[PDB]
Design a protein around this ligand. Structure first.
Ligand SMILES: CN[C@@H]1C[C@H]2O[C@@](C)([C@@H]1OC)n1c3ccccc3c3c4c(c5c6c(n2c5c31)CCCC6)C(=O)N=C4
Length: 300
């Protein structure tokens, strides 16, 4: 329907100086870096992603898909794509999220994370997702590992490696085979490989649980083959200790079998917002260079 007029920006390799690896693995490597366009007199902290070295024409098709998706989103709670670089090895340039991945941030900081933070993150992610829903986009890989931390007060949804743009009002996405995170998935997904905005809500549910348990592993133990039967059984994840029944009851709703019974992201924004006005009522926690510009201030 609506034409996608997003701009894809092609950047010169000599406009950005790498600085250090921040993570390599199966997927590839990610660099901390600076982007210093033309004469513009700005330096922009960036992360440079290079889907390994291996230039198999499979690895460039995928990174180009991510870039497609990331170029089509503009929201405070969704990660910023700056452009791509067309070297032999094709590089994704995104905004640096210095504090890293939110899952590691909760593990690394429990003893210092208060309810105000937990509830604010929940609101911010719900905003990111509500906005993806507006852009008729289905994330399919929402999990705490895929949300990054720009500042502890500001998180952004990332990893669009599995995301799909729903074509002409095509209610649900029918997927191929291939590796898929089972423990974060709606049931109608694990069984029929259907993916809906409502199935994203489910993973929102597990994402919140990962936050409230400070980074625990969903169904730690249970191998992935059981997960479907276990959920048909009516079993769900346990109420985290810090969690009031108010909060946990919202998790549980994300995990209903009737997809349309679960809450809409716009509703999750509201509920978590109300809770964020009085955090200690809802979560019970012991103790409770010169020309640098952030990407979020660098517009064109
Ligand atoms: C566990 N999740 C990973 C940690 C990581 O590799 C991944 C693939 C994962 O996260 C989504 N990843 C991306 C994957 C797809 C698009 C963008 C990123 C990405 C970015 C950044 C990452 C950082 C770290 N990853 C960063 C980034 C590791 C910690 C330092 C910063 C960053 O600063 N801006 C973008």
């Amino acid at each position: 329907e609506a034409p996608n007029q997003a701009l894809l920006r092609i950047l010169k390799e000599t406009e950005f100086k790498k600085i250090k690896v921040l993570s390599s693995g199966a997927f590839g490597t990610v660099y901390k870096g600076l982007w210093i366009p033309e004469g513009e007199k700005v330096k922009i902290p960036v992360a440079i992603k290079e889907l390994r070295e291996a230039t198999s024409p499979k690895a460039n098709k995928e990174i180009l898909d991510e870039a497609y998706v990331m170029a089509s989103v503009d929201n405070p709670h969704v990660c910023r794509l700056l452009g791509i670089c067309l070297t032999s090895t094709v590089q994704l340039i995104t905004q640096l999220m210095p504090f890293g991945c939110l899952l590691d941030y909760v593990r690394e900081h429990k003893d210092n994370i208060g309810s105000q933070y937990l509830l604010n993150w929940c609101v911010q992610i719900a905003k990111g997702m509500n906005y993806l829903e507006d852009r008729r986009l289905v994330h399919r890989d929402l999990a705490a590992r895929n949300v990054l931390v720009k500042t502890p007060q500001h998180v952004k949804i990332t990893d669009f490696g599995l995301a799909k743009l729903l074509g002409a009002e095509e209610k649900e996405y029918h997927a191929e085979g291939g590796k898929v995170p089972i423990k974060w998935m709606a049931l109608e997904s694990i069984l029929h490989r259907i993916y809906t905005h409502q199935s994203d809500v489910w993973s929102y549910g597990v994402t919140v649980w990962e936050l409230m348990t400070f980074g625990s592993k969903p169904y730690d133990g249970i191998p992935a083959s059981e997960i479907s039967s276990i959920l048909e059984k009516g079993e769900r994840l346990p109420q985290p200790p810090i969690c009031t029944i108010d909060v946990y009851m919202i998790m549980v709703k994300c995990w209903m079998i009737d997809a349309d019974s679960r809450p809409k992201f716009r509703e999750l924004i509201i509920e978590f917002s109300k809770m964020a006005r009085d955090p200690q009522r809802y979560l019970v926690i012991q103790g409770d260079m010169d020309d640098v510009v952030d990407a979020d201030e660098y517009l064109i």
